[PDB]
Design a protein around this ligand. Structure first.
Ligand SMILES: NC(=O)[C@H]1C=CCN([C@@H]2O[C@H](COP(=O)(O)OP(=O)(O)OC[C@H]3O[C@@H](n4cnc5c(N)ncnc54)[C@H](OP(=O)(O)O)[C@@H]3O)[C@@H](O)[C@H]2O)C1
Ligand SMILES: Cc1cc2nc3c(=O)[nH]c(=O)nc-3n(C[C@H](O)[C@H](O)[C@H](O)COP(=O)(O)O)c2cc1C
Length: 360
């Protein structure tokens, strides 16, 4: 089984290649990491295994989901510390995903009911609806197009949050630049309609993610920084006219950051449509100089084939890891997997649909 050959991700020598994909679960009540999160990540931590946390707020304006964890307050750092200690006691590596939703928010998630921020004033179309705190669905409002000065302020929010994650004990951070959120709102030309130095060409549309990565690289080191992108996922109106060219453009900037800093990034994480000429996943893998994590609709057989054929170094699993706390062990034994319940993906109960999925 190639999924269980060791792999060196930076200075972390992983003993297997099954990765916990970042997944918002909405159990960190009032943006404070609860003890249920520690129980949740502990059930899934393995000796030498790599875990990536749910999307985590970098600022009071970065949330678009209810009760998502933050890492911008001193209290959030202290509560994260207890979760990382429990995970590290299992011998696992854990990264915190820094997540800014951009225009994918609502007045109920913003301080003083203010409008969300984005690269543009165009809202997400009415075809998509946002989950509300009370379980209903609402309307995405018109965002506020920020200037270049506020762009640098948001970049500083990524930097301070990356330092707070290291202070909390995290082995590193992952930059969430996928799924049509703030960073994706600058990348995709279907959203970015700016005429300044952040819009138009591929270089201008890649400038934001370049500066975000450069900030966290300079703060905590490149080998503790991961980057996640999804050039060919149209979630929340995140369309690009040439997703293959955009992904290669982002990879080019990542290779250039690694040569300037003289050190390799932790990994490049690429997720795609789970319902899958060579794939875009392999093309981006061939272009990137470093560790590659494939994501999207992978199974035990597909994950084994991806590492064996050289398509990826690590394979992250999402929905299967929700319902299988010992997913790594079940993949090793080829044991049958549990079904997951979508109804409790974003509910608030600290046990129901969160930690009560049975082990093997
Ligand atoms: N922080 C993050 O980055 C994560 C947060 C959100 C989810 N996640 C990714 O995002 C996409 C969307 O997946 P999903 O199936 O949950 O899309 P949904 O439409 O929201 O699924 C909810 C259900 O609600 C149904 N449903 C029913 N009506 C609707 C309407 N009007 N709009 C949206 N969804 C609706 C819908 O049925 P559909 O497959 O679209 O025909 C769906 O089955 C996927 O690639 C996830 O991995 C990323
Ligand atoms: C409930 C749920 C929450 C998710 N939350 C995040 C998230 O916070 N950040 C992120 O980058 N991806 C998130 N994802 C997407 C997954 O990390 C991953 O890209 C995708 O689910 C892989 O598909 P798979 O379940 O077949 O492995 C989420 C997916 C689901 C179903």
């Amino acid at each position: 089984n190639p999924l269980f050959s060791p792999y060196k991700m930076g200075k972390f020598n992983l003993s297997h290649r099954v990765v916990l994909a970042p997944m918002t679960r909405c159990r960190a009540l009032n943006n404070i990491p609860q003890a249920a999160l520690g129980e949740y990540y502990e059930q899934r931590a393995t000796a030498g295994g790599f875990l990536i946390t749910e999307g985590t707020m970098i600022s009071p304006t970065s949330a678009g989901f209810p009760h998502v964890p933050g890492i911008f307050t001193k209290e959030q750092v202290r509560e994260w510390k207890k979760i990382v200690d429990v995970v590290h006691a299992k011998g696992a590596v854990i990264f915190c995903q820094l997540w800014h939703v951009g225009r994918a928010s609502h007045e109920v998630y913003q301080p003083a009911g203010a409008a969300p921020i984005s690269s543009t004033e165009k809202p997400i179309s009415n075809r998509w609806r946002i989950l509300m705190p009370d379980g209903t669905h609402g309307i995405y409002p018109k965002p506020r197009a920020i200037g270049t000065y506020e762009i640098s302020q948001v970049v500083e929010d990524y930097r301070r949050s990356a330092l707070n994650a290291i202070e909390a004990g995290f082995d590193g951070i992952e930059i969430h630049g996928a799924h049509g959120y703030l960073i994706d709102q600058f990348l995709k030309d279907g959203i970015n309609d700016r005429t300044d130095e952040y819009g138009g060409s591929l270089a201008n549309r890649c400038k934001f993610i370049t500066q975000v990565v450069q900030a966290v690289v300079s703060a905590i080191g490149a080998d503790r920084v991961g980057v996640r992108v999804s050039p060919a996922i149209d979630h929340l109106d995140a369309m690009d006219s040439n997703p293959l060219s955009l992904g290669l453009a982002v990879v080019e900037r990542l290779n250039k950051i690694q040569l300037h800093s003289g050190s390799k990034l932790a990994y490049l994480h690429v997720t795609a449509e789970a319902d899958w000429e060579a794939r875009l996943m392999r093309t981006l893998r061939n272009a990137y100089q470093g560790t590659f994590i494939c994501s999207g609709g992978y199974t035990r057989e597909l994950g084994i084939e991806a590492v064996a054929q050289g398509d990826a170094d690590l394979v992250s699993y999402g929905r299967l890891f929700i319902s299988n706390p010992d997913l790594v062990m079940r993949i090793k034994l080829n044991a049958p997997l549990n079904k997951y319940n979508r109804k409790t993906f974003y509910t608030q109960d600290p046990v129901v649909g969160y930690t009560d999925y049975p082990f093997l």
